[PDB]
Amino acid sequence: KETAAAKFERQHMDSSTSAASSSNYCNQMMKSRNLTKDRCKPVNTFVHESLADVKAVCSQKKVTCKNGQTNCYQSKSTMRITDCRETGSSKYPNCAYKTTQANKHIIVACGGKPYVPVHFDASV
């Protein structure tokens, strides 16, 4: 039922908060977004910007993706993001993450019609 675009939103978009304060944001969010249900996703980034702002990135700087494709775009300015990295002591079913907040340019792959982000590639 879930499309590639809805999936990118569930995995990376948090337009509710602007900052990932509380070292427990990742622990909470990785679980609520269903990223720990079948395994502990080792790494994941959440973007604290409006949907409209992240969607606009597909019309910004075209750059190569990490895998070599060329359907990736880099955001004009930095954006508020949260890095979630599994800790050395995390173990499925009890995944545990370290929350890291930063302001970086994000790179995403876009596709479809409407043309929207469908994959989070990297942050620079």
UniProtKB/Swiss-Prot annotation:
Subcellular location(s) per record: Secreted
Consequence of substituting H12A: Loss of activity
EC number: 4.6.1.18
GO biological processes: defense response to Gram-positive bacterium
Catalytic residues, chain numbering: H12, H119
Function: Endonuclease that catalyzes the cleavage of RNA on the 3' side of pyrimidine nucleotides. Acts on single-stranded and double-stranded RNA.
The protein's name in its UniProt record: Ribonuclease pancreatic
Organism: Bos taurus
Name of the gene encoding the protein in the UniProt record: RNASE1
Shown residues within the full chain: 27 to 150 of 150
